[PDB]
From a paper:
Isocitrate dehydrogenase (IDH) catalyzes the oxidative decarboxylation of isocitrate to produce α-ketoglutarate and CO2 while reducing the cofactor nicotinamide adenine dinucleotide (phosphate) (NAD(P)+) to NAD(P)H using divalent metal cation (Mg2+ or Mn2+) in the tricarboxylic acid cycle. Although the amino acid sequence identity between subfamilies I and II is low (<20%), both IDHs function as homodimers; each monomer is composed of three domains: large, small, and clasp domains, and the active site is situated between the large and small domains. The thermoacidophilic archaeon Sulfolobus tokodaii strain 7, which grows optimally at 75°C and pH 3, has an open reading frame ST2166 in the genome encoding hypothetical IDH. In this study, we expressed, purified, and determined the crystal structures of ST2166 in the apo and NADP+-bound forms at 2.0 Å and 2.4 Å resolutions, respectively, and discussed the mechanisms for cofactor recognition of prokaryotic NADP-IDHs.
When the apo crystals were soaked with NADP+, ST2166 could bind NADP+ within the active site without conformational changes with RMSD of 0.19 Å for 401 Cα atoms between those in the apo and NADP+-bound (holo) forms. The crystal structure in complex with NADP+ contains 403 amino acid residues (residues 103–108 are disordered) per subunit, NADP+, and 405 water molecules. NADP+ is bound with the residues derived from the large domain at the upper part of the open active site cleft, apart from the postulated isocitrate-binding site, suggesting that the substrate access to its binding site may not be limited. The electron density maps clearly revealed that the NADP+ molecule adopts a U-shaped conformation, in which the adenine ring and the nicotinamide ring are in the anticonformation with respect to each adjacent ribose. The adenine ring is hydrogen bonded with the main chain oxygen of Asn343 in the Dj loop (N6A–O). In the deep cleft, the nicotinamide ring interacts with the side chains of Asn111 in the Cd loop (O7N–ND2) and Glu327 in the carboxyl terminal of the D strand (N7N–OE1) and with the main chain of Leu99 in the C strand (O7N–N/O). The adjacent ribose is hydrogen bonded to the side chain of Glu100 (O3D-OE1) and the main chain nitrogen of Thr101 (O2D–N) both in the Cd loop. The 2′-phosphate group of NADP+ is bound to the side chains of Lys335 (OP3–NZ), Tyr336 (OP2–OH), and Arg386 (OP2–NH1). Because NAD+ possesses a hydroxyl group at the 2′-moiety, these direct interactions of the large domain with the 2′-phosphate group of NADP+ from a single subunit are responsible for the discrimination of NADP+ from NAD as a cofactor in the open form of ST2166. Therefore, it is conceivable that the cofactor selectivity in prokaryote NADP-IDHs is determined by the three residues Lys335, Tyr336, and Arg386 in ST2166 binding to the 2′-phosphate group of NADP+ in the open form, not in the closed form.
Author numbering:
A (entry chain B), B (entry chain A): 1 to 102, 109 to 409
The structure:
């Protein structure tokens, strides 16, 4: 066989969207292409120190590397070998480096049905920003990632399918539509909306987040994004009644002191407020297309998109990756910045409920960057000698040793 | 007749989209609700000083007030009187203050087929900003405003229409869709795309602009946003061949000296770059939804939406207004900032080819701010005494008399 499963650890379990983690959970990891190996191994080192520094030996991640991408092709002549697939369906938790494509990421998300795209973006003390006052940027985007126009139901204007549609709309729905038109079908599912929503609220509860904001354009798209809003409130008030409190209730007399706030904002407003007063957002709940855009903008609030981490969560598993590519320019040069993959580590740790260790990582990074101990991607702007990938991780390690 | 048309003026003519303006053009204006009267009259006063200062007496705007809104309800018992519609269909150019929606804006747009939403947004020395470096922010968003999901072709998840759509797509096109789904139809028209593109390029030529960037999400919406991109390039490479050069051609060998650059960016990249380096944008050519969102963000860059002008333009007419509302709390208190509407007039002036008057207005505003001579909405932050509406306008007038 290709992989030797660590007979020392146990697989993570899920009763109903909730993670049940063993003290020695087996976690898979894929180095990635290009800078992948250098930054991933660095992260794994940092994660371990953080785990031992927070729990001593009472907890330990039993890492299991699997092959995917260029390394897999070179070893077994298959970019996504069957055995890799088997370990993924069996352990379902993976930290993976960047993969190039001319799609492993797609396949993984689909076989584990990771419908929720999670994007946390928090300001890091020390980093330059395009914003004058980003000190309070501490939000996390929950993007439904299987619905909306991403379904791909569209047709060219000169196609026969488009014609059948125009014809059908004119007769049955009495809707007027010209011939020179491209056509796409925007779909919004109640089940899909209730899924992400339940996940967004459960997350707020367990991590003491104080607000969930539903992003939508329900005034022009009443039955798609409008319905998204409705279904979101609906399931929130029916299944999390004792934990939440709408905004229309707060300014209605009801008490919110000790509960999670749930409000909604028009797409337009958010694209404006994220720039003017981003501190207003805590958890952002959005359908597929809006969350994609909000994430791009949110992500831009802080310098170097390469220091952000993210994930794809399903009801029984998750994939954690940095928000960047392979950067073949630096492959094997010990120059790339591992903060991105490390932050995916921070995120994974939080999902696992191992917050003490995730806070250690978050704290060491803050301290290292404010202390001018950074990689070239940052050093090149603060006039200092950049640290290498390996040296930087180690600096994070010794820092965690005394905080 | 209810309206006394100035016998000294002439209507503005139209040739293939080109505004043919007499020296004594008649221009309709609507005071609007709330601060409308105060700000609109001040705009007219500054616009007339700009025109005069730039062209002495050889040109003059023959202003014609028409009634719309609550003033219309009060004088002739009609929110959008018949006499007003007739003046609009005849003169086709109007400067309109903010109107409270209880409708008129949409009705004017439709009756004049003003399909293009135009939003210029550029930095003003002295104004606060969310960005640390807004200095080179100087762009104009050209939004197609009659296509896309705004057409309203959508249906509730439990309507009989929705089930017909699901059945149709299932039997005729073989598409799998669950029953608990809201359904919306995104339409992208070749002709609507082509005309907005003609307007943008034509504006670029006319005003010595050098770059047109197409905003789209064609990688996921290939036949709608993607077609918008293809179609835009098409009309550009075929009808303005010796006026523009594509980004592909340039970084391929083609010389760009003496030509307008035409390129395209994926929507998500623009939500990032508009924040990190907006200076990279000149003219943004986008379809309905994208343009809406980018505009929201764009105008958020200056941080005083209430100082932005905008317009709706067709092949034979234009509506110019401020991006703010009726601000009822300040109605008739001579406190409201008139820069928004004045800016709308600046834009009207440029569309008329009266760039000299327009430049005067822009320079005056820049100076008034630089010299801390502003209305309260700005005084608040620069720690100086505030000028009233009336006084801020007379100051701009005092300034244009020196530049
Ligand atoms: N989740 C994923 O797996 C994922 C996501 C996006 C893209 N990709 C892949 O990336 C490949 C091409 O890369 P790209 O050039 O398109 O995006 P990239 O690999 O992310 O390179 C983008 C730029 O950002 C900087 N950068 C990226 N990672 C960095 C790091 N770890 N440390 C410091 N700086 C970093 C580099 O700045 P410099 O100019 O200083 O070199 C580089 O020029 C594509 O084939 C695509 O498949 C994968
Ligand atoms: N083009 C249009 O006709 C148009 C556009 C937008 C909205 N509206 C209409 O406005 C109506 C209600 O008003 P809204 O409150 O919804 O509009 P708004 O855009 O929200 O105007 C009110 C608020 O925005 C600020 N503001 C707007 N213009 C200002 C100015 N010229 N100077 C100083 N501050 C200004 C003020 O903030 P501060 O209190 O801090 O000074 C004020 O409290 C709606 O029914 C809607 O239909 C019309």
């Amino acid at each position: 066989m290709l992989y030797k499963e660590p007979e020392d650890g146990e697989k993570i379990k899920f009763d109903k969207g909730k993670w049940i983690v063993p003290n020695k959970p087996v976690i898979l990891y894929i180095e990635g292409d290009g800078i992948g190996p250098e930054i991933t191994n660095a992260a794994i080192k940092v994660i371990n120190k953080a785990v031992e520094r927070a729990y001593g030996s009472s907890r330990e991640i039993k890492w299991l590397e699997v092959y995917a991408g260029e390394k897999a092709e070179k070893l077994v002549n298959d970019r996504f070998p069957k055995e890799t697939q088997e370990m993924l369906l069996k352990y379902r938790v993976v930290l993976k480096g960047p993969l190039e494509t001319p799609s492993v990421n797609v396949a993984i998300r689909l076989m584990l049905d990771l419908y929720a795209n999670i994007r946390p973006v928090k300001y890091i003390e020390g980093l330059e920003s395009p914003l004058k006052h980003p000190e309070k940027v501490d939000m996390i985007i929950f993007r439904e990632n299987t619905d909306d126009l991403y379904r791909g139901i569209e047709y060219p204007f000169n196609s026969e399918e488009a014609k059948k549609i125009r014809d059908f709309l004119r007769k049955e729905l009495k809707v007027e539509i010209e011939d020179d038109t491209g056509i796409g079908i925007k779909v919004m599912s109640k089940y899909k909306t209730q899924r992400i929503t339940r996940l967004a609220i459960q997350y707020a509860i367990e991590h003491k987040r104080k607000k969930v904001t539903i992003m939508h354009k329900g005034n022009v798209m009443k039955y798609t994004e409008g319905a998204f809003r409705e279904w979101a409130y609906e399931v929130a008030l029916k299944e999390y009644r004792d934990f939440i409190v709408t905004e229309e209730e707060i300014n209605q007399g009801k008490p919110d002191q000790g509960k999670i706030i749930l409000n909604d904002r028009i797409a337009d407003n958010m694209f404006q407020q994220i720039i003017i007063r981003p501190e207003e957002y805590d958890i952002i709940l959005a359908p597929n297309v809006n969350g994609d855009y909000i994430s791009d903008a949110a992500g831009a609030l802080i310098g170097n998109i390469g220091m952000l981490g993210g994930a794809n969560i399903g009801d029984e598993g998750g994939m954690f990756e940095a928000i960047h590519g392979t950067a073949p320019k630096y492959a094997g040069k010990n120059v790339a910045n591992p903060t991105g993959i490390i932050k995916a580590g921070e995120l994974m740790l939080r999902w696992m409920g191992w917050n003490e260790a995730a806070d250690l990582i978050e704290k060491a990074i803050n301290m290292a960057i404010r202390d001018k101990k950074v990689t070239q991607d940052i050093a090149r702007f603060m006039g200092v000698k950049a640290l290498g990938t390996k040296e930087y991780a180690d600096e994070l390690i010794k820092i965690m040793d005394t905080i």
